């Protein structure tokens, strides 16, 4: 009756996903897979998984699972998604989805031709505060949106837990800004044109750690997506995304501390949009950790109902195009048409 | 010794300039001029000015003043500055300086040819809080700046006091954005390239009331200038400009209620950068009103010492270039080279 999952990639963040898989009603992890046997043992012992594999080929060979959860780094995403599609196994794939938009399109096509669902684990839009902003705007409380700011300015050491982030020529837009752009899309709709600027401030890394992006939404709204890992503040907001929205009849302001302020024609309300601290969660990551449960529960529900997921492979293409457009615009200096990429 | 000014254009805002000239040490107003005899008489009686002129030509013929203060709307600025230059009378001119960058350049050249000081009355940079942001950044408290935001988002009815604002094809950038762009230059240095997006939300006006501008500064910093007169907030912040700067060693945050937060290698400090309330001032205009005295004292000090003003006609060209470029960019969707325009 309960769905049997396999998780490929028993890394740092997979721990959160395994915890959340327990909590998910209607699904559970029956097998795990990691290339590194030290990590394969650590996650296997912590969560009590009998079926353990050193390689995905062997995992897919034995089968006996209804979906696969791909939590590896981007290098192996294309191959694993192609293995999932070849074996008719529904697939979740971590962000970043593919190395390029081209790779992502081919991965989406293969899943559509194989008639299997594909969800990108894109969990920032599933955070409680972000969901609450969506709910307010959708209700018509502030009228039609015309301007937005989506901001993530931090000085937190993400590099200890994720050392590959300090490594490449690309960093903040690919790692983090991908989330902020997904949120911009989620709240204000798809993007027509995009223009971006990037900068490297931190001397200890190779890639860019500041990006300011200006989005022209198809509905007429303009927004700012500004992200930074070189912002030294007196109160560290990591990993909060702060959101301002102006509409024809009012405003939404999601400020630091999950404080949601809404002004409209009938006055002004202040509310607490904080995440629940789950038993297995840990501050300040508890915001992200709740959303892992939300998105994995959403996956499990949608697989039973047989409907399209929110951050599906097909949908997530429209987020990833913005990431590639941003890198292009930053190197060029010029505005980039998003529609011509897709 | 006591300088004698003539003021041309006895309008709404001239009243603030006249109160301020009273308070200025080393200068006062010996004559006034306006085409509208109701305004000439109202302002003449309020401030006890004996010499009153129905036209600037006759004023300049009689003379007996050491400088001229042009507080008319933009239409008259070119002619009055050209009259000043021909009569070798130092001139202050209100914003917007000229109708176009061409007109501005010719006005600047004419004053340089005649060897007379020309200052644009551009008073937002002379506000106590804006000056404090400059002082902090100048001191090296936050290191080299790399990112900024300069924001003026309001829903205040500016149209009652200034009806002309509701009538033009152009509105927020030439009226207000001009100030915010001047502040961006003042804080982060001159701009190499610029891109802008505009919108009309308010159905009772002819011009754009929302503008989002992305600046690439010559020193390598990126900045957002975002302005709006269609933003409906719980607390109305008019007419405060909010400022965020991020530097290599810290952050500056000038937030609503004139709160100034500076974070550096030592730690955070919180200051109250509120303006003074002069005897003749009124809430909420008192910050602007104080800055009228500051810029007018600055004029008077510099005229006595023979030095150039901060917002000189020459300097103001680099502000006005950004205004004209933003309109150009808003229609094109394209980035505009500022260097090519000057
Ligand atoms: N908010 C979020 O959802 C969030 C947060 C952090 C990281 N992430 C994403 O999660 C992904 C993984 O991040 P991480 O820090 O856990 O990486 P990690 O290096 O900690 O773990 C990756 C693991 O996958 C294994 N692996 C790699 N290729 C494999 C293959 N072909 N078969 C089997 N195992 C393989 C490695 O041995 C490694 O143990 C990244 O793409 C990252 O962007 C997402
Ligand atoms: N922060 C600021 O410094 C600030 C604030 C408000 C307005 N302003 C600027 O001040 C200027 C005037 O604004 P206002 O609201 O006082 O306008 P207003 O219409 O109230 O006043 C203009 C006055 O000038 C007179 N006038 C026009 N052309 C003339 C000429 N050739 N000779 C003699 N008199 C002439 C008119 O009769 C009128 O009384 C505008 O350019 C505006 O942008 C600046
Ligand atoms: O998705 C993410 O959330 C935070 C993070 O771990 C660091 O940028 C990133 O990988
Ligand atoms: O210069 C100015 O300062 C404030 C204002 O009056 C309204 O936009 C404008 O005219
Ligand atoms: Mg379970
Ligand atoms: Mg005086």
From Swiss-Prot, chains A, B:
InterPro entries: Gfo/Idh/MocA-like_OxRdtase_N, Gfo/Idh/MocA_oxidoreduct, GFO_IDH_MocA-like_dom, NAD(P)-bd_dom_sf. Coiled coil: none annotated. Mg(2+) binds at residues 21-22, 24, 27. It comes from the Bacteria. NAD(+) binds at residues 12-13, 34, 76, 94-95, 123, 162-164. GO terms for molecular function: metal ion binding; nucleotide binding; oxidoreductase activity. Keywords: Carbohydrate metabolism, Magnesium, Metal-binding, NAD, Nucleotide-binding, Oxidoreductase. Its EC number is 1.1.1.420. The keyword Metal-binding applies. It catalyses: D-apiofuranose + NAD(+) = D-apionolactone + NADH + H(+). Transmembrane segments: none annotated. Substrate binds at residues 95, 162, 175, 179, 229. Pathway: Carbohydrate metabolism. Involved in catabolism of D-apiose. Catalyzes oxidation of D-apiose to D-apionolactone. PANTHER family: CONSERVED EXPRESSED OXIDOREDUCTASE (EUROFUNG), OXIDOREDUCTASE. Belongs to the Gfo/Idh/MocA family. This is D-apiose dehydrogenase. It comes from Rhizobium rhizogenes (strain K84 / ATCC BAA-868) (Agrobacterium radiobacter). The gene is apsD.
């Amino acid at each position: 009756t309960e769905l049997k999952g396999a998780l490929i990639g028993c890394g740092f963040f997979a721990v959160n996903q395994m915890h959340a898989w327990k909590d998910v009603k209607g699904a559970g992890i029956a097998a795990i897979c990691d290339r590194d046997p030290k990590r394969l043992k650590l996650v296997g012992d912590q969560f009590g998984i009998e079926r353990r594999y050193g390689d995905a080929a062997a995992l897919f060979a034995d089968g006996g699972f209804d979906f696969v959860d791909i939590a590896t780094t981007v290098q192996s995403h294309r191959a694993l998604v192609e293995m999932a599609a070849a074996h008719k196994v529904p697939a979740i794939c971590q962000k970043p989805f593919a190395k390029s938009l081209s790779d992502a399109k081919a991965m989406v096509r293969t899943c559509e031709n194989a008639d299997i669902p594909l969800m990108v684990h894109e969990n920032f839009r599933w955070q409680t505060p972000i969901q609450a902003v969506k709910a307010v705007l959708e209700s018509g409380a502030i009228g039609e949106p015309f301007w937005g700011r989506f901001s993530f300015r931090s000085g937190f050491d993400v590099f200890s837990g994720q050392p590959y982030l300090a490594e490449g020529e690309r960093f903040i837009i690919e790692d983090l800004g991908i989330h902020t752009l997904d949120i911009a899309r989620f709240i204000l709709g798809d993007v027509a044109t995009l223009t971006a600027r990037t900068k490297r401030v931190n001397p200890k890394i190779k890639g860019e750690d500041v990006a300011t992006i200006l989005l022209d939404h198809q509905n007429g709204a303009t927004s700012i997506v500004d992200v930074s890992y070189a912002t030294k503040l007196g109160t560290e907001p990591f990993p909060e995304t702060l959101i301002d929205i102006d509409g024809t009849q009012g405003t939404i302001r999601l400020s630091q501390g999950y404080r949601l302020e809404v002004t409209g024609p009938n006055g002004m309300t202040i509310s607490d949009a904080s995440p629940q601290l789950l038993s297995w969660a840990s501050r300040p990551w508890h915001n992200i950790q709740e959303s892992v449960l939300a998105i994995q529960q959403h996956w499990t529900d949608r697989l039973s109902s047989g409907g399209e997921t929110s951050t599906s492979g097909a949908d997530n293409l429209k987020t990833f195009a913005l990431v590639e457009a941003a890198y292009e615009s930053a190197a060029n200096g010029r505005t980039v048409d998003i529609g011509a990429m897709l």
